[PDB]
Every structure is written in C-alpha cells, then in structure tokens.
RNA sequence: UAAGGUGAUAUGAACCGUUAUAACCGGCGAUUUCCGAAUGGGGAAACCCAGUGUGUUUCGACACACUAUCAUUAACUGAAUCCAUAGGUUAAUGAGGCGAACCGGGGGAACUGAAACAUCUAAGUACCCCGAGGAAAAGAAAUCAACCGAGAUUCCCCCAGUAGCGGCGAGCGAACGGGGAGCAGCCCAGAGCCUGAAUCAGUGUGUGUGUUAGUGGAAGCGUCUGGAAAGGCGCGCGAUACAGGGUGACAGCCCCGUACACAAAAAUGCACAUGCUGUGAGCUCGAUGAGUAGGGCGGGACACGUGGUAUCCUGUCUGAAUAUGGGGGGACCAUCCUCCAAGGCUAAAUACUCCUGACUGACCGAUAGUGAACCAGUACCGUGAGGGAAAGGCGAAAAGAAC
RNA sequence: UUUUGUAUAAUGGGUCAGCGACUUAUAUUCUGUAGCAAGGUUAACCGAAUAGGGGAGCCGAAGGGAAACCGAGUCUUAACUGGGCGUUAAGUUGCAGGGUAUAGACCCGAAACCCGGUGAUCUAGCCAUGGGCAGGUUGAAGGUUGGGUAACACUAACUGGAGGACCGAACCGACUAAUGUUGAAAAAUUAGCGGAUGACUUGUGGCUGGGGGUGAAAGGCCAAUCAAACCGGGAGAUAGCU
RNA sequence: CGAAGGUGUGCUGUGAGGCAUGCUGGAGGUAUCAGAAGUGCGAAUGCUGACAUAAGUAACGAUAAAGCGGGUGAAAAGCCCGCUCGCCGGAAGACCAAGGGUUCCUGUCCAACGUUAAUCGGGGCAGGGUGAGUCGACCCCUAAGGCGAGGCCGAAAGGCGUAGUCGAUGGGAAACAGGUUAAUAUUCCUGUACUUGGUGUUACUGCGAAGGGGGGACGGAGAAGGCUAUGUUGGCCGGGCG
RNA sequence: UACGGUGCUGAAGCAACAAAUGCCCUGCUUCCAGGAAAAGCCUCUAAGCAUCAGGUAACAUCAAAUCGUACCCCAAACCGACACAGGUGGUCAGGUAGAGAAUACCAAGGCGCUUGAGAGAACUCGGGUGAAGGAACUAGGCAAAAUGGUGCCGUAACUUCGGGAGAAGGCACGCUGAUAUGUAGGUGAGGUCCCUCGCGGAUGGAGCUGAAAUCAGUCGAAGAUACCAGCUGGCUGCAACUGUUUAUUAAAAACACAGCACUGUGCAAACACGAAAGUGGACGUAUACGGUGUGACGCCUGCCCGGUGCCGGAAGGUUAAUU
RNA sequence: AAUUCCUUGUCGGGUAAGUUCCGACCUGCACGAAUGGCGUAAUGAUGGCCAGGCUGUCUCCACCCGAGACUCAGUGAAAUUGAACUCGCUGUGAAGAUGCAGUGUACCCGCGGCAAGACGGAAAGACCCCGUGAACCUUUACUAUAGCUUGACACUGAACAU
RNA sequence: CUUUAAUGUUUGAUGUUCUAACGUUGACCCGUAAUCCGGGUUGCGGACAGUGUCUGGUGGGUAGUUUGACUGGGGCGGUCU
RNA sequence: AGGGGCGUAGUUCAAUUGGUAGAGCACCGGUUUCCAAAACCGGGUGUUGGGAGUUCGAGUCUCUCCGCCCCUGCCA
C-alpha cells in the first residue's frame, strides 16, 4: 500500500473547503516514489518506496543508518 | 394485497 | 407455471453451504451471529 | 459419603449393594470417533484421495507415526555472475481461530434540530476495521500559576451553563482554582571507582489464609374441629438457632436447614517468610534525544466554526539554536517568571460482566416477566441473510376408575 | 370523533374477555407545606454507615454603570433643581404539587435518508459444455451436356440443394374472443392465432449486486417486491397532519 | 364453623361506591392511618384469544361414464372379486435424470387427515424391503469459472493474479440373456463372457522424464446408398367346425 | 393345490416383402459464419540404469474398494400454502387410414379424474339446428358461419424480375371389372455360366410387393363424404423485411435491423470497469475499434456559423498557486 | 396529412343517404430534406375504407343436447356486520329519510327469482388542493464534487549555446 | 537626476548535446516445470513522461438542496412597504 | 374573454421620450432623349388613431375610447 518505508507516512483524510466553507471528505497521500538507492557497503542498488520527505532524511542520516533502523523495524526492504 | 382494478373518475 | 424455486442440491450447497459461507469473513460473520443467537442449524448444509 | 442404587420422559426387566471397591460428591489422571483455526491433498462441513517412515505376514495386506501456511532463528545447499546475493531444502520455536461488554487505534454516515436549508447540529455517535488486557488508556512537566506558589497520570463533586465558540442562529461549552478517591516514581542516550549490594523476575520451601467434596447442629405433649392439624383450646421447652423451605389447612421445638462449632488425601488461589537462577545498588566525572523545533501551504484536534487566534497533530515545501542555549506564560514585542521537547517504563484510585456463588427487591405472576416458566431460537416462514410463535396448575397421595 | 352545524345518507366499532396511552431523570420557576432564619444548606467523599463528619461550594442580606469604578446610592452630563435604575419590604433548605427545559417524552402510523450484509435456484445479458426442431413444398449459386461465339458472353436441358424461404406437429411465443374474477389457477383454461434450420429453442454449470447490475430500451427486469431489491442497524427518523 | 374469586339478593350514600347475606369455591385475606403507582377503557379500519353474522346458503376442483352380481364388514354408490360399458394410447403408457425421502411391501386400526361415507388410502401403528470388478457416483482428465504459495496493488479490510489446485453439462477399462421376491435386480440365481491392475513363473530382451511427436480432435446444411430395430404376409405348429 | 401356485412335459420356432428420425456416418458432398481442452492411449529419445532394474510375451494367481440402487419422477410422492384443470429435462415410439410423431379408431398398458341421488323452471355456461332476409347488428363482420385435400387446367396490375401466386377461377376423385385374373415399376430365388475362388461376378427370371392412367359397369341427394384441412379480392396510411419489447390490461407506426454519414482512436490506442495493480477493447492495428445520429432499396439530401457547442490560431487584454 | 384550429374546407369518386375512405385543390392555424424528404415490390396476429362469398351479428328469436341453477342426503366456507320490533307518499332536516312531522297502507313466516335503494361491499381517493412532506428526473437554478485540464514545487541531473 | 555604453553578479527564457535519476505493456539471461513477478544484460526513451502537494479552468459525470404567500379551489394575472 | 404591443408625409419606417418630427420611395417642376423610361438639378407634404387631461407647454407624460397585431383562456 501507499506507505513510506522510511518515515512511515500513510494516507490521511481531511476536508475540501470552499468559498461557502462546504466540507467534503478527501484523502492526503504521501509523495511516494520508487528509487534505487546505492548502498556502498553491499556495493549494490536497493530499491525503496520513499516519500519526498524521506529522500531528504536519507542524505542527512546516511543510507546505512536508515537501513539499520529498517531491519529493526522489520519492514523487509 | 391484490390488484384493485379501478374506474377512478377523471 | 414455473415459480421462483427450482431445487438443486449442488447449487444450494455451493451457494450457502458451510464451506461457501466460511470461506469469507462476511459469511463467517453470519455464522458468528447465528452462533450468538443459538441457532440449531448454523448453515444450510445437512 | 454411604444403605440403598442402576440420568429423564418412564414404567418394567435383569441385577448391583447394605459398614465399606454399591451408588453418589470432589481432586488428580486415562480414554476423548467425525467435522470445525483444521494443519497430508482436495471438498458440496461431519466426506473423498494420499505420501513418507517404522513395526507387523497368514504374502491378501495390516497397525501406528509424520507430512498445512506464515513469522523468527540456526544450519546445509545455491542462479544470472567470479565472489556474493536472490533463491532452495531441512530443524527448532511462535502465531493462526473463538468469545458478552468495557479499552486503544484506523476509517466514518444520514435521518434529525435549525420549525426550509448549505456553515453548524446530530457526531467522532451508529457502523466497519485493527490490536490488547483483566482492566485498558494515560502517566513522572520543554506543566500550571502570577512576582505568592503549586509539583506525574486517572476518577468524583464544584468552579459553571461562567469565560468563550457560533448563518453570534440553532446549539456547543471550558479552564484557572477548590474539595475528595488514590498516590510512586524510574531507565537509556557513558565511562570509571566500587561491587552483586538494593530491587525485580524466574523457580523450588514452608507458614498463614482461601478455593475445589463434607461433619455435628438445640427444644412438645394433651385435647377440639377436620379427610388430614402445622389451626383452636390447654400446659411446656430451646434460642449466638423466631433465616427460609418442606411436611394432608398457618410448625421456634416433624423434616431439610439456619446460628454456632468443625473438616482436605489431592489440586489450586492469595500473602508472607526463605533457598537457588538470573537482575543489578552506590559514588565520581561526563553526556543532555536535528530533517527535530520553528516557518510557508492544505487540513485536523483543542469548548474555540480563521477569526486579531495562542497551543497540539501533519499531507506538502523548507529548516534552527542546541545550556554562553531553548520552550511556555492565548496575536505580537520587551521585561520577568517557569520549564527543558525531539528516547523509554510505571501499581493504585477508573470502565465493563459472557460466566461463578450468595443475598436483596413498595420488581412480574402465564396476553405479565427473557422471544422462550412447557424438548424455544424449537415448530413454522423465507433461495438466503433473516424473521419467529402458540403452549403452565387433577388430587394430600394415581389411590388414573377392578367389575 | 370532527365541526358554524350530524338521526344524518360524514369517521369508528360483529361481540365478549384480556391488554392498551400523562411516566422517568436532571435543572429551573411558581404555589402549598415543614424547618431554620439575616442567614439557610451542604455535594463528592469519610463513616458501622438513613447518624455523624465534610460549609468545597450555592443562594440571600446592595446597588448603579458597557466597564474601570463608585456605593444607599449610582449612572447619564461640563453640571443636573433633573431623569433612569436602586435604597422601608426575609430568605434559604426539604417534601408535595402546577409549569418549563433536555432527553423518544402519552401511545400507535409514514413515503423516505444513511450504514453493513444477503440474493442472477426467478428473470435480463454473457460464458462453457450437451440436446431438440414430424412431414410436405419452393428449386439459388455452382456443375454437366448441348445450342450459339474466334473465345466469351448468352441460351436450353439435366444435375445440384441455397435461404434470418414457404405450409405445418413437437418446441417456443401469447394476437382475438368467451369463461373464470371469495378461480382449478396471486395471470390460467377452451376455440382460434404467430414463429417453427434460426437474431431458433433447451438442459446442466458459471459470471455480472443495489445509485449498482442487466436491458434488440418498456423506466423493463434484478426470487409473486423495482423512478433505486431484500435483511439488520442508526431507529422509538421525522410527521405545524389524522 | 369456610379467605379471595364467582353468582344472586337486600340495605345504604350526592356520586365514584359501601355493607350484609344465599349459593359456588376450597385457602388464603386484611382494619385503621400513612406511603408508592405498570391506579380506573367502548371506541384508536387498536392488539391477542374466544365466539357470532351471512348460513345449512356458495362450493365439494375438468361434461373421459358408468352398471350389475358376488365378497368382506356394525354398516358398501366409493373397498375386494367377476362380467359388461366408457377414456387415454407420441399418453392420461413404459424407463430414467433432476428433486423428494420410505410415500415402496405386508399386517393392523378408523379419532384426526381424504372437501361425503369408508371396511379403503400416498392416513395412524408394527414389521419387511434397496445385494454390483462391468450400471452410475467416487476415481483419471480438462471447459467456462473459482481458489490461489510467492508476487503486484490497496487507509485497514482487501483486490488482482503466476506457479499451481479445484471445477461436468464434455473426454477416459470391461456383461449379456434367462429365472426368481408380497416388495430388489445388467446388482441375486443359472448359463455363457469380458476388463484393468498386483504377484509369481518361463522365455525373449533397451529401459527411461515434470520433456518431444502422433493420436484423442470435434461446424452447419444436404444428398443418397447399405443396413437393422420393427412391421406385414406366406409357410410351419397347435387349437377351432361356430 | 391356498382362485395363487408347485412339479413335469413341451410342437413349430421359417421365408418373402415393407422399413426408419436408429446404424454404417466422428463418413461422403458442399458452404462460410471457418467450427474445445486435457489425459488415458501410441511413439521418440535425454539425465539416470544398462549383470540389475525395467520392457515384451505366455501361463498361474490375487484384487476390483467405497457410496448410490426401494418408490414417485409431465405427478396425489417434484415446483405452485391444497391429494391444486399450471409448470418440469432425457429415453422408448405398435396396428388401420394418412405425407406425417397431424388426426380418427384401436393394441400393449393404464385409467373413469374422492360427494352423490333426483328433478328436467327462469337465467347463465358449452354446444346442435333453423323458415325468410343476408351486416339492416355494432365503435368495428367482434364472434360465428364459410373456405379447406391431391392431380390437372388456368392465373392480372405491379415488380427490386426473385416475385405477386395456392393469385383469382375451374375440372376430375367412391366401388366393381377390363386393359393387366395381382399392370408399369421395385425386389429378386432356383437354374446356368465365370472366378487368380468369396459375405464373389455375370446371366437368369420364379415368387413377393406395387402405383398411376384409361375404358366399361354400378350406388347415393351428396365419393377430398367422417376427423383433418387457406375465406378471397380492391384502395390506402405507417414501418423495408425475418426479428425484439412493457413476466401479470399496450406486440405497435415503438426497439433492433442491413445500409449510410459524421466524429474520435497510431496501439503502453481511444474508451470502459477499477482509490491502485490490472482487465476488457484485442492476443485485434484505420479494409481496425469506439461513440453518435439516420435506418433496405430507388431518386435525392438545399440556405444560415448570428446564438450555443466543437476545432484551429496566439499577437494583445485579463488572470491562480509561487516570489 | 399520424401533421389543418376554423372544419363535416371545396370539388370529384364510391352510397338511396359517406363528419370515415379514395382522387384532386392549396387557404402548409402550426410539412419539409439523415431529429431525413418523396416514392417503393415484398412483408405485416399493422391502422382506415370497400366488394364477393358466408352466416342467429341482426330483423326476431324458437327448439334441442349437455354443465350449473332447483329438490333430497352428506360435508360445509367467505367478504360484511353500532344496535333494530328494517312500509309508501309529501314536507322537513349536516341541504337526496326504514327511524323526524303529517298521512296512507300493511295478518305471522318461508321458498324461487329481479337488482331500484339501503348515498350497497372492496380499498384512510389515484383527480383537485394542502404540508416551509418524500422521491426520482432535467437544466445556461444554487453550492459542491469525481473526472479531465493548467502551472508552481518535489521525485529531477550535467554540459553548452544564445 | 536623466541618458545610459561597457563591466561582474543574481535570477530566469529558449535551443542543442549528454546519462546517471526515472520510463520501457523492446530483446536476452536467471529465479523456473512459469505469457505473473523479481534480478541481471542490452536497446530505446529521458530530465520529459508519470506521480504528490498547491493552484486556475472545466465539470448534471455524481451528490446535497432550494424553487414564497395572499387568492370566492388552484394555475395564469394581480398584489406584498 | 384576459394580458402586452402598435397607429408619424401618398406607402414603408426613424424618432426626440416636455419646449422646432426626419429618412427611403412615391409625387411635382426643370434638364437630358426623336419619344418613354433610366439618369441629373430643384422642391412641397404631418390633427403623430380619437378624446380627457398632466404641464407655463404634449405627437412624447397619465387614463379611458376606436382600429391593427402578439400572447394566454389550463387540471379534472
Ligand atoms: Mg488436512
Ligand atoms: Mg431542518
Ligand atoms: Mg488475564
Ligand atoms: Mg450437620
Ligand atoms: Mg533535553
Ligand atoms: Mg516546519
Ligand atoms: Mg497550517
Ligand atoms: Mg465572524
Ligand atoms: Mg477584524
Ligand atoms: Mg490559532
Ligand atoms: Mg391465568
Ligand atoms: Mg410470554
Ligand atoms: Mg413481555
Ligand atoms: Mg395461554
Ligand atoms: Mg340535531
Ligand atoms: Mg350513519
Ligand atoms: Mg450528613
Ligand atoms: Mg468561605
Ligand atoms: Mg439618581
Ligand atoms: Mg419550601
Ligand atoms: Mg415542578
Ligand atoms: Mg423463415
Ligand atoms: Mg409469415
Ligand atoms: Mg410455419
Ligand atoms: Mg419483479
Ligand atoms: Mg434513493
Ligand atoms: Mg430496513
Ligand atoms: Mg438517532
Ligand atoms: Mg416515529
Ligand atoms: Mg355473599
Ligand atoms: Mg388444599
Ligand atoms: Mg397501565
Ligand atoms: Mg368499519
Ligand atoms: Mg366470520
Ligand atoms: Mg346443505
Ligand atoms: Mg342466501
Ligand atoms: Mg341457492
Ligand atoms: Mg349449490
Ligand atoms: Mg373430483
Ligand atoms: Mg361394491
Ligand atoms: Mg380412444
Ligand atoms: Mg410415513
Ligand atoms: Mg401402497
Ligand atoms: Mg369415523
Ligand atoms: Mg402411511
Ligand atoms: Mg456383483
Ligand atoms: Mg454396492
Ligand atoms: Mg460404465
Ligand atoms: Mg486470486
Ligand atoms: Mg498471498
Ligand atoms: Mg481436480
Ligand atoms: Mg459428467
Ligand atoms: Mg463438415
Ligand atoms: Mg428383421
Ligand atoms: Mg428400481
Ligand atoms: Mg417399483
Ligand atoms: Mg399435478
Ligand atoms: Mg401460491
Ligand atoms: Mg405443496
Ligand atoms: Mg416443459
Ligand atoms: Mg394426437
Ligand atoms: Mg338444461
Ligand atoms: Mg352470453
Ligand atoms: Mg352451429
Ligand atoms: Mg336434428
Ligand atoms: Mg335463416
Ligand atoms: Mg334457408
Ligand atoms: Mg350499419
Ligand atoms: Mg343502428
Ligand atoms: Mg373478426
Ligand atoms: Mg367453425
Ligand atoms: Mg395476392
Ligand atoms: Mg389517413
Ligand atoms: Mg415492422
Ligand atoms: Mg413479425
Ligand atoms: Mg402485458
Ligand atoms: Mg417476453
Ligand atoms: Mg398483449
Ligand atoms: Mg429512426
Ligand atoms: Mg441538411
Ligand atoms: Mg459557430
Ligand atoms: Mg462565426
Ligand atoms: Mg381535424
Ligand atoms: Mg363531399
Ligand atoms: Mg386525401
Ligand atoms: Mg418534420
Ligand atoms: Mg437533420
Ligand atoms: Mg395496412
Ligand atoms: Mg361481405
Ligand atoms: Mg331498515
Ligand atoms: Mg327529502
Ligand atoms: Mg324515501
Ligand atoms: Mg337477478
Ligand atoms: Mg342484478
Ligand atoms: Mg360505499
Ligand atoms: Mg391521496
Ligand atoms: Mg440533481
Ligand atoms: Mg439533508
Ligand atoms: Mg398559495
Ligand atoms: Mg404554501
Ligand atoms: Mg393534469
């Protein structure tokens, strides 16, 4: 499903407003993208379904560090 | 219930 | 004149039988309701 | 525990027991067909079809055992592709489903009210989904206060229908503060000096107190009416027992019990003590949670509907300081107070009752009370989901009417 | 009962018996009553516990003003001789009652909306695999053999067996009329009628599910129910109406 | 020494009522003053049960048709037997599938059930009855389609789908005639056959796949030809002389 | 001997002809709309065995389990609340007449339909017949009556040349005899030849079966005598037609239809179903597919782009998030 | 004219008489060219009109055969129903009387018939109206929204040229 | 101040060429007894396409509703202070 | 019937909408032509349907009255 493998972002629900404040139910989905990340330690490309916010944290945290948390999370990358 | 036929005025 | 009921044991068991009902949770919820109600005959299977 | 006993309609037959292997009650085991998470495969549930291995032989067969999937772990093997990796085969553990309500979370209406109807209300209700426990959740201040102070969370009564929110309509509706119930605080973000300290979890070992069968348990006769006395009329007696029930009409003394006094081979709860197995206590010096806080955009949650709107959560886009520093004090700034987020754990006070036991009712008494006092979620109806009844009383004793 | 008005030929009732509708909680106001009284009273909770404790609070004894404030006065105004509102007047806590408010709010009754399920054993379409269509006619293309042409074309005869072809049983349809209408039957029977090798018909399975299906299209059909199925829930929806 | 209840009677109050009694019944009932209400019913096309009305009226379910004698029996238009008559005969006969579940056969009975009576019954009761290597199913095989390891996707639930695994209405080995029971038969019996596997013996010996190929294997219509089922006649056999 | 029965015995048990919708035939011929799969079965070799195993063949032998099996099954046993004038798939298909599974009468077989008995009114239902007239009835020839078969003769406008057409209209039909005692035809034995020899070939015609026609005679009012079995013609509206539709008051001029045109769509197609994956479209590719309107065929389809849509253009005006 | 209100338009044909039909006329209230126009063989349980045949359709019904209806025996409903000792007339009267006034008539009670009335029975009227009812449907009604489409940012980089 | 010529800078506008994100319902290899999927190789495309947030337009495609009263019945007409 | 519109030169139409009514054609007169017309020059024309008003003043504004158009007259 539409779940980020790094941040865990999942769809949330809200309201469409209007000039008359009419509220209609909607969904907010993450900006997910399938990317092949180069992991140096295994000299391999591993494909992850990540959000755009997740992409920013990968540079800051390091590719190895995030995967270590993923193995702790048992997300089965 | 049934089929009340009719001659309703018109 | 042909009516709404034409018996067919194979069709009856494949449609409402114990294995057909229990295959899905929705049918399993029917069994749960009938078990809660205390029905003598849970499903239509003999 | 026992002189009676082989469940009921429901007799009978054939028997078993009588002083302790009848029966009955309880504890612990044994057995526990088939279907069902169903798990060897399949399947129209209670059926069909196997494989492997061990052991049997009358050479026709036969009897057990194992063989689901997924998760986790460990071995062995094993591509493209040299290592590897994916993958594959075993072996260990664990999970599967069911179940009333209560709980947390993920989703989430409309009728209705507004005398219409869009914002709003209904309502984060109904319902669906996920997960957990006996409770859950929450929880140890980047909290409130106001220049005085308080000191985790939860629950109750106030504060108060106040302050506010709101087509400022309908309606929604606090907090501060106060009185109570109950109270408990800790760990990691790191190394030493000490040292196994406190404490917690496993387990045995006893004690105490329960639970699962039980034991004893007081004291009245006469007469009258009457089918029958427990009633009447007399005269007694017991009471830590005059709670109830039954007995041929209303029984303290007829029976079962009740008040009291006792009981456990075995299993088990609870609590204390104690022994092992882990578990680390104390001191010093450090360290002090970053794509985070904050911001832009779109929503949501706070009583608070964007409003001048703080605070909280974030789908999106950005993005700090970091103790010489930050957060908050309902726009915002200064001053001053207060606290230290971006890591965790935590009993009690709280909610509920499918179920067990006892007891209670100005609750019902067969069209009432559960739909069901009766072989009722039955008969019956409907393809199905589902809907769903009617139906109690002979008499003290069946003596149920020989002829 | 409803009405200006009912013997009314307006509604209701075959009869009896049973059942069947002003209640409950909280808050508020008013009356009655009881207690205390410028005071009255506690809530949660504690408690051998309907006592007692708990005065946390609540109402009242002081109001005026938007408010700050002032205060038996106060506001208005620059100021009032003024004017508005106040100042002599007992309240408060129980109990009962009359009301109101929030809850279903005396009871019964909608057509509907929403939510979760059950239904294509009927019917509609489609899919797979099977079956059925007596008999009698008409005689296409093509083919052969002639006649004709340089060769065709063309023509004749004979073979052939084409068709949402013909007549007509089974089968399928359902146009007319009669009967039947508390039926033999919740759509049929009788006498006629249309199609009847096809866009045919049928058996057995399968698939499409409710704002959806399916529809050679009528708002038709989707289990005797269809301009939005059925079942349960929201739900005792709502009903200025009877 | 007769409570409530019921059913009469009498008295009494302004009323809702009250008091007492005779009978029924056979065990509860309850003063007074207070307290609490599921506290008072004729109606709501009210609800449930019982009972009327129409009413001994309509109807007694195809206009295919009955009649008689005898029998059984308490009783015969309806049952049994017999003789006639009539009806169907591409069905109103016979055998199945689907579906039902004992309705089958025998004995016994007539309350209820049968639109009447019933001796009878598909009614009640008690027994009996369903016999398979070849018929089916199961089994092997697949169609549509379903499920679906992993996998892809999706708030959750879940959706789709690969390898696979199910799923006949289709494809796959083999039995016929005769006899027999109150009720069963290609199942039992008699006679005569056949098939697929297992094992063993003997002889001769290339076997072998989840693989390849072949086969299985397929339309509509039409036209005949060769046949049989079957029927007719003759012959034959037996019987008949009306 | 118990009306059953039981036991014993038991003759002929042939031919010809007719003849299927069954079989050969899952064939043959032909057509376009171009008509399952898999396994069993046969065969081929890989790896893995090739002394073995395994295969082939012949005997002997075992095994073939389990479940269903009664009965109803176009109905009183199933679906319709009923012992319900309804519905329900397959198999079997006698005689006479007949083209026939129509129809009539029968066989085998099975039934008389679970209230009767009387009476013989009105009226109602289902039928029969009808003087005279013959649609005067009525919204309307509704209904009824009538027509009805085979052979032959004959047959118009119009036509898309097929039709219209069974157009209309008419004639002959029984029975007996003769042609010809039972014909033409069909079938075909014996016999006689031939065979590289059989379920053979050629002759051969016995015996069966058997129309149709003509002639002669004969009966009746009537000979397609019953049942069965078109009413016909003329003008015209609408729709081309076969078909489909409101299960249960509407079968039509409505829908569909072939044909025509416009438009979209270049295939990871458009489009549609799906939060998505995917699927259909299509295992198709513009000679294709989707949508829309019209609705065979014949002759034709004119004028308006102002309005509203759609398409193309993009300079300018205006204009969001963002900065 | 499936289209013509006036309208039975006018004329002709058909009839004894034709508001229908057929042929023309054009004055098209308010036909018209793929929401196709005009024709069209064949087809049609198609609509209208006419003729022959044919007849109980009718003038005008009669008889007969069956099944009911009627009588007897057996079994044995239903809808409905405030209670009835349930006459006519005229008048009155929630304004159309079995029930009121006046008056007339009428012995008590069945059976077979006919339906004028009991504003007969059936079903809280479908027409009409109302409610600040319901539902579907339409659109340039309102407010939204799926979808489609535009741009910015993100996924998303490099170099060069203007 | 104007006119501004050049100068660096900071943002954009196109155009061209790349590959390395991303796409591939191209080919090939493996998982593998596999028209799924995944991985690998390669080709093609390529900073587009596509998707997310925000945003303008369109939108009976689908919803929730409104659409007055008086009135010699209503509608139409007229009226509403 | 009811409601809206219309009446302007000889015929078809503008109007200003409170203060003075135009255009086209037609008509007339004069050119041109052998002549007619076509063409050229020049020009006169109106109670603005009728009435009653409103105004200092109406074809204009108001209301009736004639004539001519356009709409409606519906549910049973
Ligand atoms: Mg298993
Ligand atoms: Mg409202
Ligand atoms: Mg527990
Ligand atoms: Mg004791
Ligand atoms: Mg910190
Ligand atoms: Mg931020
Ligand atoms: Mg925000
Ligand atoms: Mg505001
Ligand atoms: Mg402001
Ligand atoms: Mg704010
Ligand atoms: Mg009782
Ligand atoms: Mg009860
Ligand atoms: Mg109850
Ligand atoms: Mg009872
Ligand atoms: Mg009166
Ligand atoms: Mg009355
Ligand atoms: Mg107290
Ligand atoms: Mg105080
Ligand atoms: Mg004052
Ligand atoms: Mg008081
Ligand atoms: Mg009160
Ligand atoms: Mg045809
Ligand atoms: Mg025809
Ligand atoms: Mg036909
Ligand atoms: Mg229906
Ligand atoms: Mg709806
Ligand atoms: Mg419901
Ligand atoms: Mg509610
Ligand atoms: Mg209600
Ligand atoms: Mg008494
Ligand atoms: Mg007693
Ligand atoms: Mg009550
Ligand atoms: Mg009534
Ligand atoms: Mg009755
Ligand atoms: Mg009678
Ligand atoms: Mg009567
Ligand atoms: Mg009668
Ligand atoms: Mg009768
Ligand atoms: Mg009968
Ligand atoms: Mg007899
Ligand atoms: Mg017969
Ligand atoms: Mg039985
Ligand atoms: Mg029997
Ligand atoms: Mg009897
Ligand atoms: Mg029986
Ligand atoms: Mg056998
Ligand atoms: Mg068997
Ligand atoms: Mg077989
Ligand atoms: Mg699947
Ligand atoms: Mg899976
Ligand atoms: Mg299988
Ligand atoms: Mg099969
Ligand atoms: Mg063929
Ligand atoms: Mg033969
Ligand atoms: Mg049998
Ligand atoms: Mg039998
Ligand atoms: Mg039947
Ligand atoms: Mg029925
Ligand atoms: Mg039945
Ligand atoms: Mg049938
Ligand atoms: Mg017949
Ligand atoms: Mg008669
Ligand atoms: Mg009649
Ligand atoms: Mg006749
Ligand atoms: Mg006669
Ligand atoms: Mg006559
Ligand atoms: Mg005559
Ligand atoms: Mg006439
Ligand atoms: Mg007449
Ligand atoms: Mg007719
Ligand atoms: Mg006739
Ligand atoms: Mg003709
Ligand atoms: Mg006409
Ligand atoms: Mg047609
Ligand atoms: Mg037709
Ligand atoms: Mg119909
Ligand atoms: Mg139909
Ligand atoms: Mg019809
Ligand atoms: Mg059309
Ligand atoms: Mg055109
Ligand atoms: Mg245009
Ligand atoms: Mg234009
Ligand atoms: Mg007309
Ligand atoms: Mg005329
Ligand atoms: Mg005409
Ligand atoms: Mg037209
Ligand atoms: Mg057009
Ligand atoms: Mg016609
Ligand atoms: Mg005639
Ligand atoms: Mg009367
Ligand atoms: Mg009168
Ligand atoms: Mg009268
Ligand atoms: Mg009558
Ligand atoms: Mg009558
Ligand atoms: Mg009436
Ligand atoms: Mg109504
Ligand atoms: Mg709408
Ligand atoms: Mg609403
Ligand atoms: Mg109104
Ligand atoms: Mg109104
Ligand atoms: Mg109308």
**Per-residue DSSP letters for A22-75?**
--EEEEE---EEEEEEEETTTTEEEEEEEEHHHHHHHHHH-HHHHHHHHHHHT-
Question: What's the CA A58/C1' G169 distance, rounded, in angstroms?
Answer: 107
Question: What's the CA A64/C1' D288 distance, rounded, in angstroms?
Answer: 26
Residue C40 alpha carbon to ligand 13 centre in Å = 24
Map out the domains of chain A as residue ranges. 1-77
Smallest Cα–Cα separation from A8: which of A47, A54, A39?
Answer: A54
Experimental method: cryo-EM
Residue C31 alpha carbon to ligand 35 centre in Å = 57
Resolution to 1 decimal place, in Å = 3.6
Backbone angles phi, psi at C37, to 5 degrees: -70, -20
| A35 CB inside 7 Å of strand I | yes
Architecture of domain C1-46: Orthogonal Bundle (1.10)
CA distance A5 to C14: 42
């Amino acid at each position: 499903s539409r779940v980020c493998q790094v941040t865990g972002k999942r769809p949330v629900t809200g309201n469409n407003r209007s000039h008359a404040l009419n509220a209609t139910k909607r969904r907010f989905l993450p900006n997910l993208h399938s990317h092949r990340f180069w992991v140096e330690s295994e000299k391999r490309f591993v494909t992850l379904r990540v959000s755009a916010k997740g992409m920013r944290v990968i540079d800051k945290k390091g590719i190895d560090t995030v995967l270590a948390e993923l193995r702790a999370r048992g997300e089965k990358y | 219930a049934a089929a009340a036929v009719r001659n309703a005025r018109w | 004149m042909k009516r709404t009921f034409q018996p067919s044991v194979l069709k009856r068991n494949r449609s409402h039988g114990f294995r057909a009902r229990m295959a899905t949770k929705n049918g399993r919820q029917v069994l749960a309701r009938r078990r809660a109600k205390g029905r003598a005959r849970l499903t239509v299977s003999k």
